[PDB]
Amino acid sequence: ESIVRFPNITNLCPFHEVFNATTFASVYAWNRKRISNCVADYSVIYNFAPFFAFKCYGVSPTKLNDLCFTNVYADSFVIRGNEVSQIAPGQTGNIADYNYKLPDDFTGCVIAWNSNKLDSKPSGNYNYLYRLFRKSKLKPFERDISTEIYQAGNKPCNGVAGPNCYSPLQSYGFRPTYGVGHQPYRVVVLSFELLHAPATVCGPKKSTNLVKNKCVNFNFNGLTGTGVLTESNKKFLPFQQFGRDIDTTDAVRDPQTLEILDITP
């Protein structure tokens, strides 16, 4: 037999409430939601709406099911269609350099789709803003919600949008007949995080009943191998999950009943 052993979580993930929201956020005030303690289908996200971008830097859409993560993070905002490229690792410009920067080692998916139908207004939608000027670049996942006037000259400037200084925020403006490059686009960045802690988010792979004293194919919280598992009088810190040695996985921690089981080939 083969065993795959996942935590006993019985909650679905709040993904349909991040994509089907009414008013998304501005790229400078991009919203973040935490996803923890839930089983994620990732099926109502691969087929939710006709998508312009579903680029999964890092893990691959075939593999997210049967992977377990510690925390998932759904970032949400709305940018211009030309700027969906800038939501990617290692990119330069305005949106990535001053509004929303991703790390060179990013892991997760970037989804992006057209919202001209419900984010554009004939009179003009001035509810969405972007930061044009910042005194410095952004680190991965930083956020500058400031609204202070910025001066580029040696002369001071405070509380007035006079010459040599300029307000930092700029309104997009979304009229239904804008070019497709300049039309609204809603972006949801799913970012997955593995850490030295229990796995809270896990794909819908049903846990199997545990079997020791036999040579099985094991899959614990996603980490896979082969061998026989035997009850282990070893013990490591709580919130620790594996027994790397000399980098094999000597021992594992059972997600459901936190017993340490040693792996031997």
């Epitope: 035997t230 009088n233 070893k234």
Partner: antibody, heavy 119, light 109 residues
Amino acid sequence: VQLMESGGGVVQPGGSLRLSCAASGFTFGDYALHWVRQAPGKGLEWVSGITWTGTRTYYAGSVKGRFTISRDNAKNSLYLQMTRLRAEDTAFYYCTKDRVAVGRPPSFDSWGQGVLVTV
Amino acid sequence: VVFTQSHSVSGSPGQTVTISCTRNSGSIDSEYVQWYQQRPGSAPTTVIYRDNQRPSGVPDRFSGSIDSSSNSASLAISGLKSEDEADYYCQSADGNYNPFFGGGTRLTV
């Protein structure tokens, strides 16, 4: 549970000896086995241990590469074999069971009556 | 690398007694602590086969404490009958999973 031994007796410096512990009352191949010696009047000291199947061997420092340990689930037996043993090896050897098949950090569960070894 | 404890402990029938070992360089409760009873001239017997646990037959009197902030482990008697005087040893692991014992503590009713 019985863990009888055999092989007690004197030896000389740079000598050699072999101890052979039996077993009873439990499934023998499911558990690990260790050797723990007690110098007369002094405290216990771990010697060497092997796992349930038998593919790995872990030694102490004083016994780094001077002895060796094996087993046999057929004869229900555990063996130690010491060579070049110095005067600092005179002890009272106990062949000990575990509660675990691997037992790299050991947890001794049942012990044997012991076997004296001089030099 | 060392698990220092005391060399002897007094006592009296009907009372409780406590034996304390101390891990000198290493965090206690990293690994488990085992407590063995060796009477003079007999093979040992495991009294506490984890930080707290008791085997099937070891009397209800014995108890174990893994108390953290002292970096010490402590075995408590809680009822002192006739057959209770022996050298009690404590052992643990050192991360490299080599085991290491204490020095022994003799109880004398």
